[PDB]
RNA sequence: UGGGAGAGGGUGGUGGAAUUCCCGGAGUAGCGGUGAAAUGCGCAGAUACCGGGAGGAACGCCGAUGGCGAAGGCAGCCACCUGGUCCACCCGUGACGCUGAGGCGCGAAAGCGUGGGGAGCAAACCGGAUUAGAUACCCGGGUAGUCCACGCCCUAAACGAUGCGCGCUAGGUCUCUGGGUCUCCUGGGGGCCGAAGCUAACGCGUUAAGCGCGCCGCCUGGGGAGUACGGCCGCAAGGC
């Protein structure tokens, strides 16, 4: 158990996945838009991301954690909402960092992205 | 509020002067455009070449995470 | 209308209590221009309210309207190839309109033989916690709650 | 002779970001995808997270109406070999020039042959949706190919749809790169607006589509047709 952890927010255009990790990056718990009973395009809504972040944070408190550093990857619709929900869920949010992976002109994208 | 303006004379080809050269990088470790810096086009070319040399040498970063 | 906003009609306060809400309720009860019949229906309902649950009939009426008032409602909207029930707020004027319409409809759905007893029974039903109109309001608000994901589609 | 700028070309190295795969850890009920879904993937433990390793391909910011090249084209960084071009000095030669039917060389992509390589993407192909049907558009997969060496192929909206050289004819403005007497003047490139002039008009206008001279290529109503036949070239596709 630990009172300090990390919050990874993976906000694609179709879903938002939130994971709580120990200070060594090993996950303790996670939640997504589908974990709450949403399917399809509704998983991508901001409100679904808010619920997923609240659910993951609630599980983290049920584990006995009090502060999380937030890492956000992706530019989906539910990004800001999930970050704010973490900010006002009962956890000390010391810092928020953006870590979306971008290539330095690497692999060829799929046709839809060209 | 320009990087060139707030500095003295220095070598544009110096690939070891970390303190001066880092002033020409954004918060995430990206080379600044002519708008922010204030050098001429040739000076910007020399600066970009030296910055890449220093990146290879391991002094200046390639990228840094954005912090809100 | 495209040009401007519709100007609301100011009803005349009723000649028994000086309450425009009573006038609006009577207008909702009335049909085919039979205003005297609607007023008599309402006043017979008021008398029956006086008999059973012997508090002020005006108090029971206002409590019923306050209980039936809805705070959320869903409006249809087609986006792309799908129709969405967007939850939206209700202005107080539309709140009153919906409450009165639902009260009158629910009263007319009751199986009592006379209308004057139907209105009174529905009013004192909605006064506490029950009635058809309260059920309709709960259904509407549940529908609006079960669509909070689409609150951005307005 | 002295200097300059440059993704000009060839060869050898090596830097990180990211995708994929494998190993280990931790962890659980879905992930992915769309207009909406479904195929698919996942309790035989996926997705999201951390650490390690391997491999291939492409070089974010700088970066541009920027630069280089005869054209096609050229972009991480370093070293070597090599082409073109510009300015200053006004030093040498002494018309040694321009153009160019044939010839020779180069020539995007796709394609072909023999070896290698193969992450990602992706013709053909398979499946799911959509639809009246859907041999498509959208989605999940997927082989050549895309990459390297050598050898062929020789085409294009290979376009500025504008052959090359030289001289002459108001300016204004933006920009790259030199020299100076560095306010400003004087060279060489790249754009925008406009004198006169030109044009059917659109527009062009010292980077001419203006005024002239030299040489080359090409046109003569539309279709048939860049077809047929003959000839030459190519392994073939096919090219002239
Ligand atoms: Mg979805
Ligand atoms: Mg009108
Ligand atoms: Mg399963
Ligand atoms: Mg796993
Ligand atoms: Mg491999
Ligand atoms: Mg070239
Ligand atoms: Mg050259
Ligand atoms: Mg001389
Ligand atoms: Mg002589
Ligand atoms: Mg001549
Ligand atoms: Mg000839
Ligand atoms: Mg070729
Ligand atoms: Mg090409
Ligand atoms: Mg090729
Ligand atoms: Mg081949
Ligand atoms: Mg199909
Ligand atoms: Mg059908
Ligand atoms: Mg496909
Ligand atoms: Mg694929
Ligand atoms: Mg393949
Ligand atoms: Mg061309
Ligand atoms: Mg032509
Ligand atoms: Mg011509
Ligand atoms: Mg010619
Ligand atoms: Mg010029
Ligand atoms: Mg000019
Ligand atoms: Mg112009
Ligand atoms: Mg003009
Ligand atoms: Mg001009
Ligand atoms: Mg002409
Ligand atoms: Mg003729
Ligand atoms: Mg032919
Ligand atoms: Mg023949
Ligand atoms: Mg042959
Ligand atoms: Mg042909």
Curated annotation (Swiss-Prot), chain A:
Ranges where the record places region Disordered: 97-114
Subunit structure, as described in the record: Part of the 30S ribosomal subunit. Interacts with proteins S7 and S18. Binds to the C-terminus of IF-3; however exactly how IF-3 interacts with the 30S subunit is unclear. May contact the C-terminus of Era.
Function, as annotated: Located on the upper part of the platform of the 30S subunit, where it bridges several disparate RNA helices of the 16S rRNA. Forms part of the Shine-Dalgarno cleft in the 70S ribosome, where it interacts both with the Shine-Dalgarno helix and mRNA.
Protein name per Swiss-Prot or TrEMBL: Small ribosomal subunit protein uS11
GO cellular component, one term: ribonucleoprotein complex
Family: Belongs to the universal ribosomal protein uS11 family.
SUPFAM superfamilies, alphabetized: Translational machinery components
Keyword set includes Chaperone: no
Keyword Ribonucleoprotein: yes
UniProtKB/Swiss-Prot annotation, chain B:
GO cellular component: ribonucleoprotein complex; ribosome
Protein name per its UniProtKB record: Small ribosomal subunit protein bS18
Organism: Thermus thermophilus (strain ATCC 27634 / DSM 579 / HB8)
Gene: rpsR
Keywords: Ribonucleoprotein, Ribosomal protein, RNA-binding, rRNA-binding
Any one Gene Ontology molecular-function term assigned to this protein's record: small ribosomal subunit rRNA binding
Family: Belongs to the bacterial ribosomal protein bS18 family.
Purpose of the protein: Located on the back of the platform of the 30S subunit where it stabilizes the close packing of several RNA helices of the 16S rRNA. Forms part of the Shine-Dalgarno cleft in the 70S ribosome, where it probably interacts with the Shine-Dalgarno helix.
BP terms from Gene Ontology: translation
Record note on quaternary structure: Part of the 30S ribosomal subunit. Forms a tight heterodimer with protein bS6, also interacts with protein uS11. Binds to the C-terminus of IF3 and to the central section of Era.
Curated annotation (Swiss-Prot), chain C:
CDD domains named in the record: uS7_Bacteria
A GO-annotated cellular component: small ribosomal subunit
Gene Ontology biological process terms in this record: translation
Record keywords: Ribonucleoprotein, Ribosomal protein, RNA-binding, rRNA-binding, tRNA-binding
Any GO molecular function: tRNA binding
Domain of life according to the entry: Bacteria
InterPro entries given in the database record: Ribosomal_uS7 (IPR000235), Ribosomal_uS7_bac/org-type (IPR005717), Ribosomal_uS7_CS (IPR020606), Ribosomal_uS7_dom (IPR023798), Ribosomal_uS7_dom_sf (IPR036823)
Function, as annotated: One of the primary rRNA binding proteins, it binds directly to 3'-end of the 16S rRNA where it nucleates assembly of the head domain of the 30S subunit. Is located at the subunit interface close to the decoding center. Binds mRNA and the E site tRNA blocking its exit path in the ribosome. This blockage implies that this section of the ribosome must be able to move to release the deacetylated tRNA.
Subunit structure of this chain's protein: Part of the 30S ribosomal subunit. Contacts proteins S9 and S11. Binds to the C-terminus of IF3 and to the C-terminus of Era.
NCBIfam families from the UniProt entry: rpsG_bact
Family membership: Belongs to the universal ribosomal protein uS7 family.
Record's protein name: Small ribosomal subunit protein uS7
Organism: Thermus thermophilus (strain ATCC 27634 / DSM 579 / HB8)
């Amino acid at each position: 158990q630990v009172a300090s952890g990390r919050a990874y927010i993976h906000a694609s255009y179709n879903n938002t996945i939130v994971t709580i990790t120990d200070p060594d990056g090993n996950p303790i718990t996670w939640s997504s838009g589908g974990v709450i009973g949403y399917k399809g395009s509704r998983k991508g809504t901001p409100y679904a991301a808010q619920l997923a972040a609240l659910d993951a944070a609630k599980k983290a408190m049920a584990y006995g954690m009090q502060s999380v550093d937030v890492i956000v990857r992706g530019t989906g619709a539910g990004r800001e909402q999930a970050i704010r929900a973490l900010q006002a869920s009962g956890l000390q949010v010391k810092s928020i960092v953006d870590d979306t992976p971008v290539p330095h002109n690497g692999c060829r994208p799929k046709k839809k992205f060209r | 509020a320009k990087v060139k303006a707030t500095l003295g004379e220095f070598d544009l080809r110096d690939y070891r002067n970390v303190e001066v050269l880092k002033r020409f990088l954004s918060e995430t470790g990206k080379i600044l455009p002519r708008r922010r810096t204030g050098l001429s086009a040739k000076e910007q070319r020399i600066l970009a070449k030296t910055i890449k040399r220093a990146r290879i040498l391991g002094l200046l970063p390639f990228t840094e995470k954005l912090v809100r | 209308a495209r040009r401007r906003r519709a100007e609301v009609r100011q009803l005349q306060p009723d000649l028994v209590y000086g309450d425009v809400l009573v006038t609006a309720f009577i207008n909702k009860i009335m049909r085919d221009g039979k205003k005297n019949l609607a007023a008599r229906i309402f006043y017979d309902a008021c008398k029956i309210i006086q008999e059973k649950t012997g508090q002020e009939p005006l108090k029971v009426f206002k409590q019923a309207v306050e209980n039936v008032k809805p705070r959320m409602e869903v409006r249809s909207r087609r986006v792309g190839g799908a129709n969405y029930q967007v939850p939206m707020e209700v202005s107080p004027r539309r709140q009153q309109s919906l409450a009165l319409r639902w009260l009158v409809q629910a009263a007319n759905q009751r199986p009592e033989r006379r209308a004057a007893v139907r209105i009174a029974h529905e009013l004192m039903d909605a006064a506490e916690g029950k009635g058809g109109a309260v059920k309709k309001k709960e259904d509407v608000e549940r529908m609006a709650e079960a669509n909070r994901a689409y609150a951005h589609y307005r």
